[PDB]
């Protein structure tokens, strides 16, 4: 049991999957100069806990803008139009000892998702609802929204071989916590934080939750994101 | 066939340059020589992108980011005279395009073009890594216009240019219908961020939309 | 000047050549290469990643995520059974292993399988994972599977048993069957029926030769 | 002799090549190069020269030299305001900076601005030159411009204030507004209304990549 | 499009040789093969000057003085026989010119000429720095004839020669109309005395005359 | 570039030549050579083997 703290946010934790073997870092010019906030930004932003029932198909969050209303990090998105960060993501499950199940906690950089009825697009409020997660579905759906059927998560790939990305299994038999560090994968050193979704944290239950008639009918999944090494553009003159 | 002892130890054919760097025909098109002075059927266009045919498109979607020089060689035929000379004008991403076979854009000094006359070896034109960013992005989970406007998934970083092709001969006594086959080839290719293979069939050449497909082929029971 | 003579093969266009293409934009200087995380330098780095194998791909359970779940909890018939070849096998053909191997005609190597038991932390039982050599016939009973190659995998102690199946190549393969050694013993609070996930990758190193076009795309 | 074979790309005419052209006049010996003053060895030596920027380019003052004059001498609306990008901006597109940048598609660098106050030697006042970052909105008031980036430029002390605006590139830009901090205080002999000239060049060093044809010529 | 981080540091594309040294088509012309034994439509002329088309002319007027070798490559077509052979005769500034397709000037040993037969690679002829002075002058604020006579602005130092082009075939059964496209290219170029860019449109190809044009595009107010 | 001139015999196909053929499968790496018993490196190693001679080859 390790009680990590960052700024004015302390969580209680119980091995880290460093995404692509790299730890996030700063970009290191007088023509373009970055600003490193360091202060705040790095604290833990615990999202709303998500109840995992027997019939839950999955969830996804789209970052960096899932934190668009989260404190100073969600406020520096409105004043600077360029930025980058690292996003240590803790995922606890705090189930009991009689609950069973298994989760895939994967990050999927550049998850370009497909519309539900092709030949058209979706109204841009179907990919993300800032803090709250869009759930997947168990079967196919229609309408101007994301094709959120599992087995074809968002991208038209098999959902089983989604393990190629930075992932972590949460088997309630053994463990309950996951932690992933995603060192800002992008093709340009800095990009706008409202246009571009750098990665898509999606939690997918492979083995479904099961229990008997006495336990609690759900297992709350707690998501915590710490934006590390966040740096922005400069606002001062040179 | 029979199961033989396939005994060897090699992964030189599994590297990225030995997997992607293969020439494939990506653009057939017809273009005439005479008649209809204001027509769009006297030249070819082909905006250069990797999402041309699904066999190559599938390989570029193994990887999220990749950068590579392209080295295309056209194979130009003709049907129905003099000896014919062609022009394959590559315009960069920032470049004026012709509207007609006799536009002034064809004479632009910043648009490099090859003048291949018939009978010789095929014309080869090589284009470096043009993009503004540091790699071409196969996938772009983002919006071109800020504040979640239209045009999902299309970034302007992975723009490669266009390829305008015409006869340089002004006219002809009879009709000559030339056919061009552009052979695209990635070169000096690097690739980042692997990605699971495509499962569903492709719908359209500018989006990732799909129909929900089954994972694998089904069998009768779990034990057979 | 220099007396040259053109050989057969001059002024032709061989599709697979590696000649110096004359660059169209010589003045142009390309963008400097930054370090982007997660470079791939070889395709067989994708095959070495574990990924979930749809063992329960029966006729009505392939468009859901019930394809990946092996139901555990009749001791006379095996739990599951499948051909051990990532090509031409419905179970292992759309795996990351089995999908980077359909780009090639000649491949040879070994393949490791991980069985993650996704049941309760109180459920306890034994499963017997038998392997048949590529020429041998499948075991029809549990005893005949015990007399061959097997691993009696105690679930209550460890929850993940790893194999490494050799002699996997094409240019009539093995079998990974699984048997009830014991039933799943469970206290009154925990549920009775559990699931077992499977995984597959390249075990140590994988050999692969002749590139071709994939059959899946049409 | 030497067995050669022609590759694809033989006997073609690529427009952008750098081959050894056979000289038509080989006997001819060209005139010796004398030293002529003022050699240009790089185009960005033209962009580094200051030149007057037509800020007052309103609908009827562009064919006279009233385009270059910013009238100084209502404190609620700013004196002048313009986009800070030498391309696609009416104020900075025909500058020496903005004209050597329309020959190119990719350019990135910084740009310095000099405000020469061309009033009397007795006129005294203050002007507040605010800069908005490329994402931010313009200040609607003088106080909201004071809370951002600014320089309260005292005219009576110095008559030339120099900026250096970074993050200037294309492949939604900044703003240089100017405000009356104080009015122009003037003795009884000197005139009341003054002018402010502006200038623009490359601040330290300028980066520019992809050559194209200019849009201005038809 | 969107504003990206255009991060790099390079000015190799802004040097003079990487700015001026680009091949651009500067002369299209027709010339027949037979008929009208005394006619001016059986050969081409094109007195070589930089003031050919306004796109290139604008770049040469960035600089007052410049010196450079020129390396032009013609692209010759034909319409309507035998295999055709052409002749591209460059006469120096001091050189006799033909008056007819069958003049004796075509046989002058001091006029270098290429004999390109149809079907091969395009003919390339390179011309050194001919001028009498030490540089070509883009602008000449002076009078050719002393004591302020006629012909303002035309010096004889920036004379480059002419380019007479004909068929060498004496006749043909039918009519053949050939088209030539001269691709001018400065080479090994130096440039002195920079100069502000042209603002007004061009009027005529031998003078600097212009119509008074507005400085920039107008906007509504000074503050919008 | 380099001034070359084609001799007589250019662009012909002599059947018995030993020129460098451009390989169609350059990426392809061929199977390693194992040792197989009984290599022939010269035809006259077959002539040196005794073999029975049909001396009594009469008409029937």
Numbering used by the authors:
A (entry chain B): 13 to 26, 30 to 43, 48 to 257
B (entry chain A), E (entry chain A): 43 to 122, 132 to 275
C (entry chain C), D (entry chain C): 1 to 73, 78 to 175, 187 to 233
F (entry chain C): 1 to 60
Please quote the paper that reports this structure.
Viruses from the family Picornaviridae form non-enveloped icosahedral virions that are about 30 nm in diameter. The capsid proteins VP1, VP2, VP3, and VP4 originating from a single polyprotein form a protomer, the basic building block of the icosahedral capsid. The entire capsid consists of 60 such protomers, arranged in 12 pentamer units. Here we show that the exit of the RNA from the particles of echoviruses 18 and 30 requires capsid opening and results in a loss of up to three adjacent capsid protein pentamers.
The interactions of enteroviruses with receptors or exposure to acidic pH in endosomes induce conformational changes in virions into an activated state characterized by increased particle diameter, reduced contact areas between pentamers of capsid protein protomers, release of VP4 subunits from particles, and externalization of the N termini of VP1 subunits. Receptor binding or exposure to acidic pH induces the transformation of native virions into activated particles with reduced inter-pentamer interfaces. The conversion of echovirus 18 virions to activated particles occurred in <3 min after exposure to acidic pH at 37 °C, however some of the particles also released their RNA and aggregated. The electron density of the genomes is distributed uniformly in echovirus 18 virions at neutral pH, but transforms to a grainy appearance in activated particles at acidic pH. The inter-pentamer contacts of 11,000 Å2 in native echovirus 18 virion are reduced to 5400 Å2 in the activated particles. Correspondingly, the interaction between two pentamers in an activated particle of echovirus 18 is 25% weaker than that in a native virion. The weakening of the inter-pentamer contacts together with the changes in the genome organization, probably enable the opening of the activated particles for genome release. Comparing the cryo-EM images of native virions with activated particles of echovirus 18, as well as other enteroviruses, reveals that their genomic RNAs undergo conformational changes upon exposure to acidic pH. During the shift from neutral to acidic pH, the side chains of histidines of capsid proteins, and probably also parts of the genomic RNA, become protonated, and thus acquire more positive charge. The changes in the charge distribution and putative release of the polyamines from virions may result in the observed changes in the genome structure and increased pressure on the capsid from the inside.
